[PDB]
Structures are given as structure tokens and as C-alpha cells.
């Protein structure tokens, strides 16, 4: 990219400084002796810039010189307080480069003169994004609380260093923790912070959501860290008793689903894209409820959902073979390949009640086409385009396939009461999409939910790849193949009588299905036969035969991925069914309070087996 | 079900009534302090109850307060003999709590103050059942007996504890100890009970059937228990002699053998359906049984019976083809479709004497068909119903295929003397059935046999996954192909002219079978080109090819769990042929034993090299 460059030019410009203005390099070097001469007699300098317009103290601070800043905050007890200024860095202070290189005795140096420990680090490098490397928040607090120097962590708080702050993101010292991926001291430094949580008041530093409304309990899970995930599930988690081998305990369930708002940490599961954000169905409270919520109540409604979803495609599929239909209402087959003796009807007859059956039997089936747009049309007006024409799985393209099933049956509607001739083309349509939608209704059972999203997966992942191939090698013996049987009879041996028909027929003899032009009551061109032969060899056994490989060699490379999207097939089936089915069939799940001294949080019991002494 | 659930809700009502009540409250947390207070000048309380009806010391003892304990024997010295009062916890007195929680000082006072240490403990969630997690059985000694606890073991006995005692599943203690799957010391416990046992009047302990007939060594078996399965082995098997590093060893044999009297280890295997009990079958003095019981006598006898099924079906495949017929009786020339010219005949046409030479062909062939119905009706007659219909691969489904084969064959034997037409279609099942039933004695061959474990494994679990995702896309084109063809004449292109026949042409084009259909002097409709494209994308390289790595990936799979079951195929065969043909012929397994000096126990001897 153009704006990538701009990084480039400007740390090599920021260098070219360095090799002018003598006092910048004496700070580089840690040249205290001409720093000295430089200074106590003419000095005339001191509030130099840079590229980025920082000082010599911060060239001082980046590269670890404590007796070279010495002499800078003896010199000017003014440069500890102005910022960096530029476009990339902005608001960054010689507090920051001092606690990021882990320079404890420069930090307590800076603390002593007086150092701003709120500067806001607002620049557009330490914006959280991919092209950036590493992400640490904004204030010094935070950027000492990621790398785990917990000893100048102590040393912030001391003076002043507030826990609670929000980024531009509205992020928390908490919700930074979780992102780092070298985790390796985030469960030591975490419970850190908590002991600075003393004394405040009654939102007790966890509450306090990010500016898109997420905890750090919820960010965990979001974000993928088994690591927190579990750390944070043992303050949670009350133990009620042991005996011998047997220890049953509770859990809070306050927000692993309690699905009750808007949020439930379930919903936020199947939605994401993060590869690990998907294996917290493993976890030890969420695999229960994903169980139970199915096992007992969600398996039943959806079957019900199903079956009453397949005699739905029948009655249309019953109406559709009885249309009305005329024998050949004018015309007699003028000069040829007019094998069309029918003709259907002027809807001027539904006289003959086994043609009004079917009219009540239509208007079921027309009044099924406006339930599903009712209840798609307001799925758009929730959540954008992109989830449906986005090749997420977790209900995957059976949300594109049921409106446009939904959307040719109207035009059937409309192709009725009008009389216009070609009305087979939505019909068409509408049951090879209308008896492949009950593909979505393979999906709550045990043998034949994981075998669906093989088949999702070489449709676009492993076609899309060989088609483009197809269609090459087709396009050029089809077209070969016009040229030899030009100048021949399409009576005798007429697999080729023009272009349109050349594909289709060449598309056939590349998947073995017809047999192959032969005749032998005449004579066949030579070239024919070269021809043919070279089209039979990279078709039949080298592109399909290698095909049949293509599919094996990944098809046993990902079966530990489908038996992880399967299970989380199965959990978003069940959250679609929690948020819209009424609260008259489904408990919430779980164990209230206030019953019992409790309160009031809905609680689950669990028991298992320790099996030490 | 709401049951399991219904233990969770009385599990927090234990945890409400011990905040009401303190002494009950200070018993958690054994505050001795306090309970001097509740006690000394008032107290009035002391016979509490909870939501099982259980008592201060058994609070006191559950979490493990054994200083709160003390003041509780010295304030009430009743506490001891009652049990807990509910369904899901019967009986369990407050001795079983401070034996599991291995609490030695106080199962030392409680006995000082004398407990009854052999009642009987009996709530709902102590029986063997699957859902509940441990099962220690039901009298005390066996909680001390399944933890590992030597001492309380020890103790127990000492103040008067009888080892003898089964509970409602008729089990001992050395039942018990088969069923906790980390052993780990049950076998170094296992000799700790066998030492208090004296070898009294009465029978030795290892001798003792459960409620349902069965002893500590065949339970061994059953359960597919390994390490137990060695070391019950080592006190029933003798050293002969060595010779260098030759061993020769002469082994028990005593209930291992069928021998009749059906309740045998070998007969108990399998039939089972554990999987890991068909695991036991590789311990040295059970394979080589199982080698030459086959080897000389499984092997020939098979075969052999294997040789008169193929004669049975050739003698009605040959009667099958040589049916009488007329040519076409009265009727004449429905204007199409009728190409049928043949008609049988009635049965009044016994002449001409390749009717006489068919004549037996049919009662040969009908005989067969009775003593089928002879040898297996006492297998549905002796509780097979759910064994035939169970998918238990040890005699699978060809025990329903010979039935149906039978079946079938006296259908048409009600279908002569009776002139009724359909004869052809029972006659059609006698003919895939009956040979494709010649495929269970493909069992005992040594290259053949693990292959039809791969078809039947296939049938079940590798297909009926595949003719789901068929039946729907199938019938979304038949129904798609019958609309564009249905304004086509049937008289050119006739593919689809009703609708059952386009279910049925277009189930071979999913196939490649048929050409798919042309016909290049008339003009297809447009729509037709469009649509059957697509569906020779999905067929040919998108659901057949892969069908193909589907079977693929699960056959390397399967590789050493059809090497399993094939083993235990062929045993399953000889045990099942042992006690079905007379003893004369088979000898009894092993060397006797009176005739020499030895006890009437049939032995058997097996000499291996050490190293
Ligand atoms: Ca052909
Ligand atoms: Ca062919």
C-alpha cells in the first residue's frame, strides 16, 4: 500500500536527524562528555524535534541511557512533561518509552520530577489494528500491566495511577489482558489489578463494559482464551460438598447463557469467526447446558419444526404435477423437432372439483411463500447482507436458498393471472430448491449432521477449484469438435449440429454419462478419432480419477473440524429457538433462587468424580 | 425426565434447613465454641433433622469435623444407631460417611461406642444404576473394601464384621471389587480378604453365585476386566516342570470348558455385548483352546455342513427355473405394454416325467424349509427376540434373512394347490435370499471372512447415512424432470411418461446407468438443458465420488476393529456348534483326570519359552 511507505520514510527521516544536530547523536551514543560541553556554556537548543517531534530525552529513553537522561532532567525539568506530536505517534511521553524498555530506575526518576502517569497515548500506531504488531491500551498503567513488569505496576499505583480508564476502543485495563496471545503471566498480572480493587464503589471494576458492551468475562469467551476463561470460571464457582470421590458444586450461570436481554455469552459463541472462540463449547459449565437444552427440549421442537416442514413441500409438490393443461391448442408441427403436443390452460376453467382440490391446495402453499418472507425480511432488518452471502457455516447458504424458494412461488402468482406462456422456469426452480432445503433438517441428528457440511464444503472450497478447470478443457474439444463434424450430416451421427448443442453434449462425454459418438455403418473423419482419443484419456482417466483422490486426500485431513462445527451446528439451532419460541414450553434453564436463601441467580449443579486420594 | 433433576432440587434443601437450626449450622463449620453454648443449659433440640432426615453427627462427619464430633458422642450417645430417613439416602448410617472420607479417629470412636456394622444401606442412589457415578455396594465394609483403605479393612473385622453378606444384588465384597474401573490396589486388596478367609465347614468364598448365578472368577470375565482376569488365573494354575527356559504348564480348566451346564465363561463372552469382554480372548489358557477346539474340530465340521447348504439351494435354484407354463391362456393384445405371452399352468399337469425328476426337486427343497423353522425357533422361544433384531455381529443378521428365507419358500408351497397368479414375486425373495444367505459360512475362511464384516459394517453406518441425502435430492429432480417433460410427447423421449416411472428413471441417472436421455432429432425444451446439467454435477462428482472417500476414510479405520471382531466370529461358531451336535464325535476338550492321579479336573497343558 501507499500509506505503509509512509512508515518507512519517516523512521529513515527520523534517523537522518539523528546523524545532524550533534546533541541528538551525543544522546543516542550515551555521550555524556560532549553533552556536558554542549550544554553548560552556549546549550541555545534544548527544545530540539525530530521527524516525530520528539525530544532528546525521548531519543534518550528509547535506547536505554539513564545517565544521558540525568543530565536532561537537570538540564531543561521541562521535557518530562510535553508529548510526542506527529501523525503516527501523538501524545506519547518519555513515561511511556520508560516503562516498555522495563527502565525501573528511570521511572522512578520521572515519577520524582514529576511525570504526567493520564497521558493519553492517542497516536495512530497504538490503534488496535492488524496491521499493527502489538496493542497495549493508552495509558502507562496498561502498558506496564501487558508485558508483566509488575514491579513497576506497584510503582504506578503509588502515584496516582487510576484503575479504572477507557480507550478509544472503550476497553479497560481488564479487557486488555485478554488480547494479548503470549499469555504466559496475564493469570498472575490479572489478579494483581484485583488487589488494588480495595476500595471504590458499587460497580466493582468488572462491570464496567468496553464501548461495544462486553466484560471481561464476556471478552474471554469472544475472544478465545481458554486460558482466562478458566481463571476467571473459579471465582464463579461455589463448591457445596465433598464426599469420597464425589464433589458437587455450582455455578453461577448469571451470564454463561441466561439467555434473558440481548447478549447472552451463547450468542455471542455462534456468531464470531475466530476459530477459537468456538472451542469454549468444550469448557466445563457450557457443554452441560448445550446438552440439556437440546437433549430434553431442543431435539423434540425441531423435529416437530421438521416434520411438519416436509408434508409443507409435498402439498406443493402434489399441486404442482396436477397443472391444467390443453392438447396443442393451434399449431401442427411446421418443420421439424416440435415434440410439444400440450398446451396449458386460460385460467378460465377450475371447473371439476379434482381441479378445485387443488385450489384450496395452492392457497396453502401461496400463503407459505409470505410466512417465510415475513420472517426473513425482518432478518435483514436486524443484521446486514453480509451474513447471508458470508460463507459462515453456523447457519450457512439455507438462508439464501428458502427466499429464493419463497421469491419463485410469487412468481408463479404472478405468472398465474396473466396468462403468459412460460411458467415451468419458477416451477422448475422452486422444487429442486424446495426438496433441497429439507437438507437444513439433517442437521439435528446424530449420523447425519457431519456428513451435511462435507458436502457444503466441496461444493465451494473444492468445485470451485476443478470447474474453472472444467471449463477450460471443455471449451476447447467442444470447439474442436464442431469443426470436424461441420462439414458432415447431423442425421447420421448428430452430436454436434451447432455451437449451443456442442457444449452441451462435449459437457456429457467429460463425466462419462452419454456414451460417445460412434457409428459404424459410415465412415468417420480421420482427425475425429486423434481427436477424441486425447479427450477421452485427460477426461476420463486423468481428471475425474484424480478428482476422486482430490476429495480423499481432504477429506481425512479436516474430520476433526467437522465434529467441532457439528456440535456448534447444534448449539446455534438451539439459541435460534430460545430468542423465538414463547416462554410457555421453555424453562429457563437451571435452578433459581429465593426459594431457597440464594439470590436470586439462576444456578446449575454439578457433580463429578476426583479420582486421587 | 425430571428425576435427576429432582435430586438436584432436594440437594439445595440441605443447604437451607443448615443455615435455619444452628447446631446443625456450627456442625459445618465445627465450631466448638458455640456448640457448647446450644448445648450445656438448654439445648432441647438435639434431634434434628435435615432434608433427608440426617442428623448433627452426620453433618459433622460429611465435612470431615471430627472435634465437633466429639462433643456430639459425649452430648448425645444415640446418634449411632439410626439411619437417614429419605428415598435417596436409606440407611446409610453415619459410620458409611467417615469410612469413605477416610476418617480414622473417629470410625475408631464410633466403633468405641459400637455402631452396627452390618446394616444394610439402601437408597436410590446406591443401586447399580448407569447414571449414578460410584457404586461401593451396600454394607460398610465394602466402602472401606473399594477405597483402598487397609486399615478400616483391618479394623472392621476385628469388632466382629461378616465377610459373607450380599446385598439386593446378591454381590459379595470380592464381586465389588471387580467393578471399580482404576484398580490399582484391588488387587493388592484382593489378597488381604482371601487371608481372613479360613476354609471353614461351609464352602470357600470364591465359590458363592450372585443374584443372577455367577461367580468372582466368571465376572472377571464378563466385565472385561484384565488385571483381575490375571491375577484370579495364578491360584488355579500349576507348574509342571522347566527345562531351561522351556516352561510347561498345566492350567484348571475347571469352568472355563462348556462342559455343559450353559452358564460356561466361553458360552459368557460371547454373548455379551461389553466390548471390551471379546478383549479376553487373547489370554494365553483361553486362545489355545479356542485354537484347537476350531483348528481340528471347528474347521472340518463347518465346511462340511458348509458343502450341504450350497447342494440345498442348487436343488431349489434348478427346481426354481423348470416351472410349468402355458403359452398365453385366453388373452389377446392389450395395444400396448403388453408383452406377456406365458401363462402357468393350473396344477392338474403332472405328465411327462421331468415333472416327476422336478417332483422331488420341490420336497427336497420344501423339507429344508421346515427344519429351519426347527433349529431356529428355540432361539426367539429361548429370549432371542431381542438378540435376532439386536445387531449383536456374533451370529448378525443372518439369523432374519433364514427366517425370511423359510418364510417365503412356504408361501409358494401355499401358492401351488391353490391357482393363485402371483407366484413369481415370493418366489423372486427365495432366490436373493436364499443364496445371498450362503455368505455366513464365509465366516471360517482365513482370507474371505474379515471382508464380510466390512459389508455388514457398511450396510449399517456407512449407507444408510448416504440414502438419506439421496431420497431427498432425488426427488427433488424426478419432480423437477416430470413438469418440463410432462408437454413432451411419451413417444419420443419417453423417459418419464407417469411419475412413478420418473422416481425410477431418474434413480438410475443417478447412478450412471442409463445414457441419459437424447435424442437428437427433436428439439428439447430449453429448461430441460439447463436443469439436468446440474444434476450431473451433484451425482457424478459431487455425491458419488464422495460416497467413495467416505468408505475410504473408514476403512483404515476399522482395520483392527473387523481384526477383532473376525476372531471372535470363529468362536462364536464353535460354541454354537459344541453343544448342538452329539458328543461322540467331538471329544471333550483337554487330558481327564482320575485316570491318572489328579481330582477329576479336566486339565490341559501348554509349554512356552521364557527368555
Ligand atoms: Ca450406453
Ligand atoms: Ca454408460
Same mark, same amino acid.
Given at each position: 500500500e501507499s500509506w505503509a511507505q509512509s512508515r518507512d520514510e519517516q523512521n529513515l527521516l527520523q534517523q537522518k536527524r539523528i546523524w545532524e544536530s550533534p546533541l541528538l547523536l551525543a544522546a543516542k551514543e550515551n555521550n555524556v562528555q560532549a553533552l556536558i560541553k554542549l550544554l553548560?556554556?552556549?546549550?541555545?537548543?534544548?527544545?530540539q524535534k525530530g521527524a516525530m517531534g520528539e525530544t532528546a530525552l525521548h531519543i534518550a529513553a528509547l535506547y536505554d541511557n539513564l545517565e544521558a537522561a540525568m543530565v536532561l532532567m537537570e538540564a531543561a525539568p521541562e521535557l518530562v512533561f510535553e508529548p510526542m506530536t506527529s501523525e503516527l505517534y501523538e501524545g506519547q511521553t518519555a513515561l511511556h518509552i520508560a516503562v516498555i524498555n522495563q527502565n525501573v530506575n528511570l521511572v522512578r526518576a520521572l515519577l520524582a520530577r514529576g511525570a504526567s502517569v493520564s497521558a493519553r497515548a492517542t497516536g495512530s500506531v497504538f490503534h488496535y489494528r492488524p496491521h499493527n504488531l502489538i496493542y497495549y491500551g493508552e495509558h502507562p498503567l496498561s502498558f506496564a500491566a501487558c508485558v508483566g513488569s509488575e514491579e513497576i505496576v506497584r510503582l504506578l499505583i503509588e502515584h496516582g495511577a487510576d484503575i479504572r480508564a477507557q480507550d478509544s476502543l472503550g476497553n479497560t485495563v481488564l479487557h486488555i489482558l485478554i488480547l494479548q496471545p503470549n499469555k504466559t503471566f496475564a493469570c498472575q498480572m490479572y489478579n494483581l489489578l484485583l488487589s488494588y480493587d480495595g476500595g471504590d464503589h458499587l460497580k466493582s471494576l468488572e462491570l464496567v463494559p468496553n464501548n461495544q458492551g462486553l466484560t471481561p468475562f464476556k471478552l474471554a469467551g469472544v475472544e478465545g482464551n481458554i486460558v482466562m476463561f478458566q481463571h476467571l470460571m473459579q471465582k464463579r464457582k461455589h463448591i457445596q460438598w465433598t464426599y469420597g470421590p464425589l464433589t458437587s458444586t455450582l455455578y453461577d450461570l448469571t451470564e454463561i447463557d441466561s439467555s434473558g436481554d440481548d447478549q447472552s455469552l451463547l450468542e455471542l459463541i455462534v456468531t464470531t469467526?475466530?476459530?477459537?472462540?468456538?472451542?469454549?463449547?468444550? /469448557? #466445563?459449565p457450557v457443554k452441560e447446558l448445550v446438552s440439556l437444552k437440546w437433549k430434553r427440549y431442543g431435539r423434540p421442537y425441531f423435529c416437530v419444526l421438521g416434520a411438519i416442514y416436509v408434508l409443507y413441500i409435498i402439498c406443493f409438490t402434489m399441486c404442482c404435477v396436477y397443472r391444467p393443461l390443453k392438447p396443442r391448442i393451434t399449431n401442427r408441427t411446421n418443420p421439424r423437432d416440435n415434440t410439444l403436443l400440450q398446451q396449458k390452460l386460460l385460467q378460465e376453467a377450475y371447473v371439476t372439483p379434482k381441479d378445485d382440490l387443488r385450489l384450496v391446495g395452492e392457497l396453502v402453499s401461496i400463503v407459505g411463500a409470505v410466512i417465510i418472507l415475513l420472517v426473513e425480511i425482518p432478518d435483514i432488518f436486524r443484521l446486514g447482507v453480509t451474513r447471508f452471502?458470508? /460463507? #459462515?457455516?453456523?447457519?450457512?447458504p439455507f438462508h439464501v436458498i428458502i427466499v429464493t424458494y419463497a421469491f419463485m412461488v410469487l412468481v408463479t402468482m404472478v405468472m398465474r393471472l396473466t396468462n403468459?406462456?412460460?411458467?415451468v422456469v419458477p416451477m422448475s426452480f422452486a422444487l429442486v430448491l424446495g426438496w433441497c432445503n429439507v437438507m437444513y433438517f439433517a442437521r439435528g441428528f446424530q449420523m447425519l449432521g457431519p456428513f451435511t457440511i462435507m458436502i457444503q464444503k466441496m461444493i465451494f472450497g473444492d468445485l470451485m477449484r476443478f470447474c474453472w478447470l472444467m471449463a477450460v478443457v471443455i471449451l476447447g474439444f467442444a470447439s474442436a469438435f464442431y469443426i470436424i463434424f461441420q462439414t458432415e450430416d447431423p442425421d447420421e451421427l448428430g452430436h454436434f449440429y451447432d455451437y449451443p448443442m456442442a457444449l452441451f453434449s462435449t459437457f456429457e462425454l467429460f463425466l462419462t454419462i452419454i456414451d460417445g459418438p460412434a457409428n459404424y455403418d459410415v465412415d468417420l473423419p480421420f482427425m475425429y478419432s486423434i481427436t477424441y482419443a486425447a479427450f477421452a484419456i485427460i477426461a476420463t482417466l486423468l481428471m475425474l480419477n484424480l478428482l476422486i483422490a482430490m476429495m480423499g486426500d481432504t477429506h481425512w485431513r479436516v474430520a476433526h473440524e467437522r465434529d467441532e462445527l457439528w456440535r456448534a451446528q447444534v448449539v446455534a439451532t438451539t439459541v435460534m429457538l430460545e430468542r423465538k419460541l414463547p416462554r410457555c414450553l421453555w424453562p429457563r434453564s437451571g435452578i433459581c433462587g429465593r426459594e431457597y436463601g440464594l439470590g436470586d441467580r439462576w444456578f446449575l449443579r454439578v457433580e463429578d468424580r476426583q479420582d486421587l486420594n
Open positions: 553548560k556554556f552556549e546549550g541555545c537548543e534544548v527544545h469467526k475466530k476459530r477459537e472462540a468456538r472451542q469454549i463449547l468444550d /469448557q #466445563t452471502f458470508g /460463507q #459462515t457455516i453456523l447457519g450457512g403468459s406462456d412460460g411458467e
